[PDB]
Swiss-Prot record, chain F:
Organism (species): Nicotiana sylvestris (Wood tobacco)
Name of the protein described by the UniProt record: Photosystem I reaction center subunit IX
Lineage: Eukaryota, Viridiplantae, Streptophyta, Embryophyta, Tracheophyta
Similarity field: Belongs to the PsaJ family.
UniProt key word Transmembrane helix: yes
Gene3D superfamilies per record: Single helix bin (1.20.5.510)
Subcellular location field: Plastid, Chloroplast thylakoid membrane
Function description: May help in the organization of the PsaE and PsaF subunits.
Entries under InterPro entries matching the protein: PSI_PsaJ, PSI_PsaJ_sf
Entry annotated with the keyword Zinc: no
An annotated GO BP: photosynthesis
A Pfam entry, by short name: PSI_PsaJ
Transmembrane portions of the chain: 7-27
Domain of life assignment: Eukaryota
Protein topology in the membrane: Single-pass membrane protein
């Protein structure tokens, strides 16, 4: 992961900021507000972007795959927007508290990783189970990298991480798109796509007045 | 040559100076050792000429500060329009403006504060507003809440524009000193460009959007069926029915047949009986004439072509046997000193605000404004206070110019030199005038009080006793009442209903205006006003004239403009700086404006405002008690202060309960100011010495050593609290009285 | 002409009074939505005005419905769109 | 007045009055024997306190006596 | 050189080096002293040439449908005055395949991709022949003169090989741009005064010239 | 970034943030537990 001063930029013909160097994957020189000027801020922001990207990828899958299969009839899942207010085997509060406990353990160990890199790579109960990762944000090991694709040449690793970051950015945009589309149109996302494909000249945002 | 002159990227945009408080000055930037530093940072924030000696650097700073102020004003206007659109009963008030009170603020239901949402009418609960925005919106032709939302959005956009302009002109394109000193071009553009074109555009709006919509409104048609403003431009036929002259187009304008436009361009005078305000056809013609006058005025000075005047040429040609070289040298002073220009502009603006206040009550321009007494009283008092404050600031900055920028070796002027060579004669004569006016104005009140207390009503100065008739003002009133017949033949009625034309305008069973009679009591209050104005002028002029030196202190200029004293020597030298003189003159300005607004309130409630029945009988709010009661101090104490405070003191448990609370709070703050005004910092530093011991005993003593406030700072705090408490007391009392009884 | 729009207003006095009442009532209830329980935490992700046309909140929807009524396509002064 | 305004303003004003008297015809024939000066710093505090106390006492004495004597309780 | 309302200030920096130079600058907008951002000599010539280029196409855009529809070439409903095509909905609008507000976004994207790329040439001369643009960047490198890029796309016929023809062509282009600028200003002023299109205005004037002019039209 | 964080740690900004949070907390407590004269 070496400097790349001739990489494509978000704004062709401009000069990338000095802190955006090109060693990080998926770097296009985009930081107009100077939010990552400090090295510590950049270190924190990289991890924040990674976790946001992965969570939004899972969210995009969970919204768009089940709702496409409902329109085909392979599944009969309810709408994603109102799926939170349905009745389950337990009330929503205890589900949220159990999720808080479990995800809090996981997130606290991730926080310990961020603050101190080695720190938490070893099993608390069985000393022999270790995470084989090396860089922060990529824990590795049998649990988070069973197939071994997470380690390799310093050149294929950069592109493998760039694909992840760009897919996560796209999913991050898509989740908010689905949310606002449901707020402003009153129907599902696949309905919106089909309606827009039927009448692209009219079935848009401006078809609300 | 007059041309755009800028410098590129003079100051880098960074957050590094935000993290260093006091960066703007050499002394403060080093960090604090005591608490005084914390105050010194805020007192010197906008003292730009003390930060740097470069005139260009100072000028750029003021240029960007003006953009910041404009952005703040645009934000305030956007908020006002948004609250009118979203939290107001404007649309209901439009259909019944005589029975519904304007309201544009609604409080949340917390801790029982929801009692302030009173019954303002129209199925609406809120806080009654006295800004007069509803009448201005009705005059402009605004009919729906949607047009107020668009105005709020536009004002937000404009505020963003001004903020960006300030940043751009301080950090990217900073104009040079020569650009600012192009005074002829600035005067030409402000006279012809800003004022002339602005008034022309407003006249166009009035003849195209205001006149037709108000004609529909005054005819009694529903606001929701009036055609939209653009419909009066699209099909001109709609405009050719209210005024058939519009069928002729612009041909009469270009062929010089202007009387063909007499339908919507008039010279009437008086008030609209349906509305109670000035005729809109009069206002449109006024603005159209003002536009031409200012457009011609803005062509007087020479900028780049031969035609025009030179300001220096005009100044250097005005001299005489009594004034030596005359005005020569004033162009150099007024083009190199920001403080002199600030002083002049502050004086003129403060004087103009008072004229605006006087003219708006006698000639109500907005519809249904005259019969809304709470709005009239509030506007008059507000503009009087603004004018007084600006006038005091004028003296402050004239003193600052005298202390800092005065230099006879390089910027000599004969007039200023000759004024400084006989300042003793000026100040002694003003002293004598102040004493004479104080005696022959206030001692008449004491004479009346003593005669009344001694059982001798026949020895007083009253209309039923020894008379003092304002014959000159009465003659002016009679002359103005006869103007439509002999001296203004084209005018139909006099410029105001108060001159004496023997007519009264009533709107909704309420008196708008009527001839205001002048008698002995008015003779008394007018000389009281003159006395207070003269004393304020004396205090401020003595500070301006004696700022550099006096017989007591030959070298007062080296001590600065704002210093506490020069020690207890020479008998005592407290408050000799020009700053102290402003500090003292603020009190007298407050006194004068308070007397003026009290006079206005009592006179309007006694002899103008009231109710009228369907018989022809007028009943005023206080029943004409001003003539016989306002001639004694006991009369003011009893029939005005005691009688009219009965509202604000019984407002608890009602929608007006917030005014009694503010009444008490203002009294408290006014009393609080006397601790600062009557004491000194030597006692307080010694008292703090004991508290610091108690903190050190428990290891909680701060590193920033606590200091008592400076001698000058204590005076500033005392005067600020005094003024705030005094003005808020009258604010609450006036608003409660005029909302409950008006 | 004035005495034609007077005729127009005579026939629509009640309807315009119902517009005035609705628009003032909505303006007052905008400060009381949360206490009423109409527009709050889980549905105020956007404006209560936005919720007025997608959820039918009690008082901010009557104003929206009544606002233009009996008016033409391009002649409602309280809505730019109305019948688009 | 004595509690708020301080000495230097009054001394600088008295200087002008001295000049005005010294330059006025038919008044130059009359001369003061003690040079007019402003009140001292401590003297002004005492004078202002005396006025404050006298007004404070008289206002309340008048109010109390009149209010208790208008109705006799 | 022929001068039209010159001045001492104007002739100091207007020396005939630019096409269509007549020393005309009464307000001194092109003065190089203390000049930056919008008011600089190099941005103003580019702005003049660029505005003339758009006005030259705009005059034909306004005049073509009305002239063609006055003949039997295009269907009557597609032959409208330029202000009745939907640009000014109060004067009328046409129904296209897409909503006008949706067409505005499409135009915004395409024209933005064009104009930001044009600007990055001005702010960085050779910048846009470097980053990958689907292979078009091979012909988008510019020439160092912002208003005259040339290349395979913008100057494909390769006219003005020698200096003497390029200068003459530049003069003709700035002159036609000025003339079309004035023509479009005339269109904008005539549209509200006389309710009909420019071609109707032309025809109505060469039918009875003494009753169709500004003097008569001081009524609308 | 560092300088802006330093500025946001200055006394007035921290003071307004802290008192705004306190005011919001007290207002919400009074909204959900109004008219408290005693402590049950
Ligand atoms: C398409 C998106 C994408 C891509 C390209 C990657 C890419 C990567 N991730 Mg990653 N990740 C993603 C989404 C993605 N991730 C999401 C959404 C999550 C949250 C669950 C994670 C959580 C995660 C962790 C916790 C770790 C990685 C690791 C890695 C690295 C090695 C693994 C690999 O080659 O994955 C290749 C990925 C694919 C070919 C995508 C296949 C997706 C389909 C649905 C197959 C799923 C099958 C499954 C059994 C069901 C590599 C840089 C590891 C690493 O860096 O090791 C040191 C590591 O520790 N990621
Ligand atoms: C001079 C202009 C001005 C003034 C005086 C007001 C005044 C008011 N507006 Mg208003 N407004 C304005 C301009 C103005 N506005 C503009 C330009 C717009 C258009 C955008 C609006 C749009 C608007 C709406 C939409 C509403 C108001 C409302 C109100 C009222 C309540 C405001 C309130 O409680 O704040 C709310 C509180 C805050 C904004 C907090 C203050 C933030 C500061 C920085 C401190 C931050 C500390 C924070 C609170 C603590 C938590 C921080 C976190 C990190 C923990 C009040 C009378 C409300 C009203 O009247 O309800 C009936 C209402 O609903 N206004
Ligand atoms: C016709 C031309 C014109 C106009 C309209 C103005 C108008 C104004 N000038 Mg101004 N000025 C002009 C020419 C003009 N100037 C010239 C030629 C010079 C150089 C000699 C100056 C030098 C100058 C100084 C040094 C200062 C002003 C200030 C002001 C403002 C006074 C505050 C006020 O009344 O608020 C009225 C508010 C409005 C009418 C709101 C609308 C705002 C207007 C429309 C924006 C003005 C745009 C401007 C004319 C050109 C923009 C440049 C362009 C590239 C975008 C006011 C906006 C003062 C100020 O506040 O600075 C910010 C100030 O300190 N002017
Ligand atoms: C800056 C202010 C201003 C503005 C922008 C306008 C704008 C307008 N006026 Mg106008 N007007 C104004 C002030 C203004 N007026 C004043 C002060 C008067 C009183 C003398 C008039 C009297 C007036 C009449 C009598 C008429 C207009 C008309 C018009 C419209 C068409 C003008 C046109 O193209 O033909 C004239 C333009 C040129 C010859 C150039 C136009 C919307 C006409 C119209 O269509 O009415 C809707 C029309 O018949 N105006
Ligand atoms: C457009 C008008 C204008 C402008 C541009 C200035 C500009 C200036 N004045 Mg000035 N002044 C003005 C009007 C103006 N003044 C008026 C009207 C008066 C008469 C009252 C004065 C009286 C005055 C004095 C006596 C002095 C100045 C000084 C100064 C300079 C330093 C200002 C500074 O750092 O303040 C920093 C700002 C503050 C410390 C903020 C003060 C906050 C005030 C006191 C509170 C106001 C109460 C508020 C409205 C109510 C809030 C309620 C609360 C509960 C929130 C600066 C050049 C000083 C100087 O040295 O000049 C060289 C100086 O000694 N001015
Ligand atoms: C009600 C309280 C009060 C009164 C009566 C005065 C009175 C005066 N102040 Mg003042 N002042 C006050 C409060 C007061 N001040 C306060 C609180 C402040 C602080 C802000 C100031 C600050 C201040 C300044 C800064 C200045 C004055 C000035 C003046 C004088 C103005 C000239 C004048 O009117 O003479 C006429 C005299 C009177 C009106 C007093 C009442 C006399 C009546 C007629 C009764 C007299 C009857 C008879 C003589 C009694 C004899 C009986 C025998 C047994 C003794 C005057 C002596 C100015 C000055 O000296 O200019 C000349 C001046 O520059 N004052
Ligand atoms: C020293 C003077 C003083 C005292 C003792 C009080 C005491 C009280 N006031 Mg009060 N008030 C005062 C001054 C004072 N106020 C002033 C000066 C004003 C004018 C601004 C007001 C205006 C005012 C209003 C408008 C209201 C009160 C209310 C109250 C009561 C609040 C009960 C409450 O919220 O508990 C709940 C709060 C807590 C339990 C505190 C919890 C703190 C933390 C979060 C605990 C968590 C960590 C453990 C309480 C009896 C309210 C009331 O109901 O009165 C009956 C009410 O509506 N006061
Ligand atoms: C009063 C008589 C009067 O006002 O005469 C006006 C008189 C006229 O002076 P001049 O004619 O010498 O002034 C010429 C130029 O200064 C006028 O721009 O001014 C003075 O004599 C100075 C004293 C004015 C203030 C006097 C008080
Ligand atoms: C959009 C977004 C972030 C956008 C940020 C941007 C553009 C910032 C840009 C800048 O900072 C930079 C780059 C550089 C600066 O100089 C300039 C600016 C401009 C300041 C994050 C979204 C992030 C969005 C995320 C993480 C969403 C995750 C969603 C999940 C997990 C959803 C789960 C569910 O949908 C299912 C699966 C099933 C349902 O039934 C249940 C639920 C729970 C609803
Ligand atoms: C760009 C332009 C117009 C472009 C028009 C276009 C694209 C039109 C497009 C459309 O029609 C179509 C195609 C189809 C329609 O359905 C839609 C629209 C959109 C309607 C006009 C410029 C028009 C520009 C003009 C007229 C500029 C005039 C400037 C002058 C006269 C300045 C003179 C001075 O500056 C100097 C020379 C020297 C100084 O010192 C002194 C002064 C006097 C200040
Ligand atoms: C009362 C008084 C003081 C004492 C008043 C002082 C010292 C005011 C300063 C104290 C206030 C309360 C500021 C202190 C508050 C801190 C800035 C922040 C505290 C932290 C939280 C409580 C916000 C003088 O110093 C003085 C000087 C000259 C003439 C008259 C007087 C005078 O009358």
């Amino acid at each position: 992961f070496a400097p790349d001063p001739n990489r494509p930029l978000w704004f062709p013909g401009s000069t990338p900021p000095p802190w955006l160097d090109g060693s990080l994957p998926a770097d296009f020189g985009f930081d107009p507000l100077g939010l990552a000027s400090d090295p510590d801020s950049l270190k924190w922001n990289v991890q924040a972007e990674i976790v946001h990207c992965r969570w939004a990828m899972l969210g995009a899958a969970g919204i768009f795959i089940p709702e496409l299969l409902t329109k085909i009839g392979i599944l009969n899942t309810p709408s994603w927007y109102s799926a939170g207010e349905l009745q389950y085997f337990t009330d929503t509060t205890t589900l949220f508290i159990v999720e808080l406990f479990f995800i809090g353990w996981a997130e606290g160990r991730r926080w310990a990783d961020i603050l101190k890199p080695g720190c938490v790579n070893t099993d608390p109960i069985f000393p022999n189970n270790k995470l084989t990762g090396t860089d922060v944000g990529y824990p590795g090991g049998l649990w988070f990298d069973p197939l071994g694709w997470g380690t390799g040449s310093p050149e294929k690793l950069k592109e493998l991480r760039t694909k992840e970051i760009k897919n996560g950015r796209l999913a991050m945009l898509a989740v908010m798109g689905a949310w606002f589309q449901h707020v402003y149109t009153g129907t599902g996302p696949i309905d919106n796509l089909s309606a827009h494909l039927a009448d692209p000249g009219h079935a848009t945002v401006f078809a609300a007045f | 040559e007059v041309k755009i002159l800028v410098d590129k990227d003079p100051v880098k945009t960074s957050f590094e100076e935000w993290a260093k408080p006091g960066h703007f000055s050499r002394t403060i930037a080093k960090g604090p050792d005591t608490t005084t530093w914390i105050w010194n940072l805020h007192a010197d924030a906008h003292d730009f000429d003390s930060h740097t000696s470069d005139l260009e650097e100072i000028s750029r700073k003021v240029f960007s500060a003006h953009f910041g102020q404009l952005s703040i004003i645009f934000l305030w206007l956007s908020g006002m329009y948004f609250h009118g659109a979203r939290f107001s009963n404007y649309e209901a008030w439009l259909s019944d403006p005589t029975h519904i009170g304007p309201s544009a603020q609604v409080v949340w239901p917390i801790v029982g504060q929801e009692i302030l949402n009173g019954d303002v009418g129209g199925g609406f609960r809120g806080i009654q507003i006295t800004s007069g925005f509803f009448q201005m919106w009705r005059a402009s032709g605004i009919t729906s809440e949607l047009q107020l939302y668009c105005t709020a959005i536009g004002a937000l956009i404009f505020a963003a524009l001004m903020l960006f302009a300030g940043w751009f002109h301080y950090h990217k394109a900073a104009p040079k000193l020569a650009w600012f000193q192009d005074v002829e071009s600035m005067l030409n553009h402000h006279l012809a460009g800003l004022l002339g074109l602005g008034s022309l555009g407003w006249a166009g709006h009035q003849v195209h959007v205001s006149l037709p919509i108000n004609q529909f409104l005054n005819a009694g048609v529903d606001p929701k069926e009036i055609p939209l403003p653009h419909e009066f431009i699209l099909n001109r036929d709609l405009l050719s029915q209210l005024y058939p002259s519009f069928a002729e187009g612009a041909t009469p304008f270009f062929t010089l047949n202007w009387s063909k436009y007499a339908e919507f361009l008039t010279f009437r005078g008086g008030l609209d009986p349906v509305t109670g305000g000035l005729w809109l056809t009069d206002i449109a013609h006024h603005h159209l004439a003002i536009a031409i006058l200012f457009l011609i005025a803005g062509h007087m000075y020479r900028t780049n072509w031969g035609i025009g005047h030179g300001l220096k040429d005009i100044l250097e040609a005005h001299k005489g046997p009594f004034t030596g070289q005359g005005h020569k040298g004033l162009y150099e002073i007024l083009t190199t000193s920001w403080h002199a220009q600030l002083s002049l502009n502050l004086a003129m603006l403060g004087s103009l605000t008072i004229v605006v206040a006087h003219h708006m009550y006698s000639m109500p321009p907005y519809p249904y404004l005259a019969t809304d007494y709470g709005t009239q009283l509030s506007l008059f008092t507000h503009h009087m206070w603004i004018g007084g404050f600006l006038i005091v600031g004028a003296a402050a900055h004239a003193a600052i110019f005298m202390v800092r920028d005065y230099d006879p070796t390089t910027r000599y002027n004969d007039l200023l030199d000759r004024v400084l060579r006989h300042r003793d004669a000026i100040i002694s004569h003003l002293n004598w005038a102040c004493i004479f006016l104080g005696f022959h104005s206030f001692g008449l009140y004491i004479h009346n009080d003593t005669m009344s207390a001694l059982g001798r009503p026949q020895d007083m100065f009253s209309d039923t006793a020894i008379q003092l008739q304002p014959v000159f003002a009465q003659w002016i009133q009679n002359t103005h009442a006869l103007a439509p017949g002999a001296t203004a033949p084209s005018a139909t009625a006099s410029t105001s209903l108060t001159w004496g034309g023997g007519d009264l305008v009533a709107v909704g069973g309420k008196v708008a205006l009527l001839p205001i009679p002048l008698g002995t009591a008015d003779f008394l209050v007018h000389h009281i006003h003159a006395f207070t104005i003269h004393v304020t002028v004396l205090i401020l002029l003595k500070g301006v004239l004696f700022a550099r030196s006096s017989r007591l202190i030959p070298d007062k200029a080296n001590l600065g403009f704002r210093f506490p004293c020069d020690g207890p020597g020479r008998g005592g030298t407290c408050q000799v700086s020009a700053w102290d003189h402003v500090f003292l003159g603020l009190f007298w300005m407050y006194n004068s404006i308070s007397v003026v607004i009290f006079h206005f309130s009592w006179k309007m409630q006694s002899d103008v405002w009231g109710s009228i029945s369907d018989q022809g009988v007028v009943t005023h709010i206080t029943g004409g008690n001003f003539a016989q009661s306002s001639i004694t101090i006991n009369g003011w104490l009893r029939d005005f202060l005691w009688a009219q405070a009965s509202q604000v003191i019984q407002s608890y448990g009602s929608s007006l309960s917030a005014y009694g609370l503010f009444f008490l709070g203002a009294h408290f703050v006014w009393a609080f100011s006397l601790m600062f005004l009557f004491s000194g910092r030597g006692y307080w530093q010694e008292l703090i010495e004991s508290i610091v011991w108690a903190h050190n005993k428990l290891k909680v003593a701060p590193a920033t050593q606590p200091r008592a406030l400076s001698i000058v700072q204590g005076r500033a705090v005392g005067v600020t609290h005094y003024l705030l408490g005094g003005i808020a007391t009258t604010w609450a009392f006036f608003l409660a009285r005029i909302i409950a009884v008006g | 002409v004035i005495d034609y729009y007077l005729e127009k207003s005579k026939a629509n006095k009640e309807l315009n009074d119902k517009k005035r009442l609705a628009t003032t009532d909505a303006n007052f209830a905008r400060a009381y939505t949360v206490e009423f329980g109409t527009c709050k935490f889980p549905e105020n992700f956007t404006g209560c005005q936005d919720l007025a046309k997608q959820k039918k909140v009690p008082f901010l929807s009557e104003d929206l419905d009544i606002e233009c009524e009996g008016k033409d396509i391009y002649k409602c002064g309280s809505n730019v769109f109305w019948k688009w | 007045m004595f509690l708020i305004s301080w000495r230097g303003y009054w001394q600088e004003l008295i200087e002008t009055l001295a000049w005005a008297h010294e330059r006025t015809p038919l008044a130059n024939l009359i001369r003061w024997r003690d040079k007019p000066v402003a009140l001292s710093i401590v003297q002004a505090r005492l004078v202002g306190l005396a006025h404050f106390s006298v007004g404070y006492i008289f206002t309340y004495a008048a109010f109390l006596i009149a209010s208790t004597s208008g109705k006799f309780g | 050189r022929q001068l039209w309302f010159a001045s001492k200030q104007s002739l100091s920096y207007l020396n005939g080096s630019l096409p269509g130079d007549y020393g005309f600058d009464p307000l001194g907008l092109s003065d190089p002293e203390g000049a930056g951002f919008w008011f600089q000599p190099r941005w103003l010539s580019y702005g003049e040439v660029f505005n003339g280029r758009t006005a030259m196409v705009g005059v034909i855009g306004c005049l073509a449908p009305e002239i063609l529809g006055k003949a039997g070439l295009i269907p009557p409903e597609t032959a409208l005055p330029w202000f009745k095509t939907g640009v000014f909905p109060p004067a009328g609008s046409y129904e296209y395949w897409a909503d006008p507000y949706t067409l505005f976004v499409f135009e915004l994207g395409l024209v933005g991709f064009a104009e930001h790329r044009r600007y990055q040439d001005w702010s960085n001369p050779g910048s846009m022949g470097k980053q990958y643009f689907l292979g078009l960047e091979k012909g988008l490198g510019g020439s160092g003169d912002p208003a005259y890029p040339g290349g395979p796309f913008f100057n494909p016929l390769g006219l003005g090989k020698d200096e003497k023809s390029m200068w003459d062509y530049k003069v003709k282009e700035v002159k036609n741009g000025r003339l079309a600028m004035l023509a479009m200003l005339g269109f904008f002023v005539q549209a509200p005064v006389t309710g009909v299109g420019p071609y109707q205005n032309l025809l109505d004037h060469l039918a009875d010239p003494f009753n169709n002019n500004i003097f008569t039209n001081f009524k609308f | 970034m560092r300088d802006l964080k330093t500025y946001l740690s200055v006394a007035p900004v921290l003071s307004t943030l802290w008192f705004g949070a306190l005011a919001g907390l007290l207002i919400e407590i009074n909204r959900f537990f109004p008219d408290a004269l005693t402590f049950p």
